[PDB]
Structure 1
Amino acid sequence: GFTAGLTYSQLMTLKDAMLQLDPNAKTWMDIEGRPEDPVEIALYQPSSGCYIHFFREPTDLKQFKQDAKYSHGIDVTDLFATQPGLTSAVIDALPRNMVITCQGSDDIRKLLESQGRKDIKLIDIALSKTDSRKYENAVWDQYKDLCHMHTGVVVEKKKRGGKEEITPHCALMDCIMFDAAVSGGLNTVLRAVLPRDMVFRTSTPRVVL
């Protein structure tokens, strides 16, 4: 009967921040990592420009390393300071019966189900791969400063020929670029809902004991 990980004052700061969301606005959600073990989560409301964006340390390092190599390029060492319990706390605070839009609803559905949020309705936009990435370059160009976490070289698995590096997948850039694909364009200021010191715990020196 408590929210694990966060103290009450942190939780209230989070709940107040989540009230910045318009409960009825189009809201995209995207994750990196499998829904059972997500490492990056984003929600985005293009109307206001509000976005939720945070990270989580993986339970399964082996699968994480595969995903880093072939999908997201996140270095696990940059996840050590993430706030335990944050994913559950954020999802708990989403408005009841909210409608969320996503590209491929299977993984979002599983994540929300695991949090007991079957009340949330999902719209699967079902863009083709090519259509979904139309604005990929434009989105990184404009918004790269919003996520510096994709540091690793990401590759395409190939049977022959040379190495092929690809642009890493970011949950936040995904939301923005999928919305742009649906809207037929990418307008030129977004606003973070969560405080930086909530997403990452400040690290300090220690003597190892």
Structure 2
Amino acid sequence: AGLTYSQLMTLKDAMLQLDPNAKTWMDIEGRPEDPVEIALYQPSSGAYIHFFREPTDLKQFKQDAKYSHGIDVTDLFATQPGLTSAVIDALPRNMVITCQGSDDIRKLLESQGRKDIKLIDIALSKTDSRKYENAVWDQYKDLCHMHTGVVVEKKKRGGKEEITPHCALMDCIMFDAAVSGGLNTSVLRAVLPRDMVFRTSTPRVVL
């Protein structure tokens, strides 16, 4: 039980908001065979696709949560099943996608039968990739609250050290800002409706 026919048609029309000739970044959290967060981003217009997926392998998810995304698995229980395959299905033919480390992105697209999509492998160094990390999280903190856990990294002299969690959306933004040499001035806008990315949406708080 994935997307209904009405959801698929809404997704198809929403994909027209993407400029197939403009630069499109993409990044994922989790392994390509079991992703939990997916983001596509067109900095020219600010349009972005952002959604989540419940993991199949809970054991590997715990490790990815500790060393990468810090997502609580219980926050993914209300995600829309089949949305990953549906979004990749609706991507324009022969689309060019930019990403930092295209290997895992390629495996994901190929598993969905999308070998027509051309990938541009950006190879930013570790220090260059995070040069705008603090600024992007500060400006776009409201766009993703899914990274609640403490993410750690091993240091060569013993013990762990907390790092900023990795977000597939903040990655697209901060990597594009590093390559562009400055943060984009466009106002970001979600392509996917909110009732499509989550099956149950919490209503706005009445104060």
Could you say whether these structures have the same fold, taking a TM-score greater than 0.5 normalized by the shorter chain as the test?
Answer: yes
SS at match of 2:41: strand
Q: Percent identity?
A: 100
Instruction: Give how far 1:41 is off.
Output: 0.2
Distance 1:205 1:178 in 2: 33
Instruction: Give how far 1:203 is off.
Output: 6.8
Going from structure 1 to structure 2, the CA distance change for 1:22 and 1:206 (only over 3 Å counts) comes to closer
Going from structure 1 to structure 2, the CA distance change for 1:178 and 1:206 (only over 3 Å counts) comes to closer
TM-score between the two structures when normalised by the length of structure 1: 0.93
Going from structure 1 to structure 2, the CA distance change for 1:20 and 1:66 (only over 3 Å counts) comes to same
Instruction: Give how far 1:158 is off.
Output: 4.0
Superposed CA deviations along residues 147-174 of structure 1, whole A, max 9, x for unmatched, are: 0000000001346434310000000000
Distance 2:105 2:175 in 1: 15
Distance 2:151 2:191 in 1: 29
Residues 70 and 157 of structure 1 are in contact (CA less than 8 Å); yes or no, is this contact kept in structure 2?
Answer: no
SS at match of 1:95: coil
Distance 2:204 2:166 in 1: 34
Going from structure 1 to structure 2, the CA distance change for 1:144 and 1:181 (only over 3 Å counts) comes to same
Residues 30 and 37 of structure 2 are in contact (CA less than 8 Å); yes or no, is this contact kept in structure 1?
Answer: yes
Q: Which residue of 1 aligns with 2:175?
A: 178
Superposed CA deviations along residues 72-101 of structure 1, whole A, max 9, x for unmatched, are: 000000000100000000000000000000
Q: Which residue of 2 aligns with 1:83?
A: 80
Distance 2:142 2:204 in 1: 31
Instruction: Give how far 1:187 is off.
Output: 3.0
Q: Which residue of 1 aligns with 2:151?
A: 154
Residues 14 and 194 of structure 1 are in contact (CA less than 8 Å); yes or no, is this contact kept in structure 2?
Answer: yes
Q: Mark the runs of 5 or more structure 1 residues left unpaired by the alignment.
A: none
SS at match of 1:156: strand
SS at match of 1:164: strand
Residues 140 and 173 of structure 1 are in contact (CA less than 8 Å); yes or no, is this contact kept in structure 2?
Answer: yes
Query: What is the number of residues matched between the two proteins?
Result: 206
SS at match of 2:160: coil
Residues 69 and 165 of structure 2 are in contact (CA less than 8 Å); yes or no, is this contact kept in structure 1?
Answer: yes
Residues 41 and 171 of structure 1 are in contact (CA less than 8 Å); yes or no, is this contact kept in structure 2?
Answer: yes
Residues 43 and 184 of structure 2 are in contact (CA less than 8 Å); yes or no, is this contact kept in structure 1?
Answer: no
TM-score between the two structures when normalised by the length of structure 2: 0.94
Which runs of 4 or more aligned residues in structure 1 lie more than 4 Å from their structure 2 counterparts after TM superposition? 203-209
Q: Which residue of 1 aligns with 2:16?
A: 19
User: What is the CA RMSD across the aligned residues, in angstroms?
Assistant: 4.0
Going from structure 1 to structure 2, the CA distance change for 1:46 and 1:163 (only over 3 Å counts) comes to same
Instruction: Give how far 1:127 is off.
Output: 0.7
Q: Mark the runs of 5 or more structure 2 residues left unpaired by the alignment.
A: none
Instruction: Give how far 1:125 is off.
Output: 1.0
Instruction: Give how far 1:207 is off.
Output: 25
Instruction: Give how far 1:202 is off.
Output: 1.0
Residues 39 and 58 of structure 1 are in contact (CA less than 8 Å); yes or no, is this contact kept in structure 2?
Answer: yes
Going from structure 1 to structure 2, the CA distance change for 1:14 and 1:100 (only over 3 Å counts) comes to same
SS at match of 2:154: coil
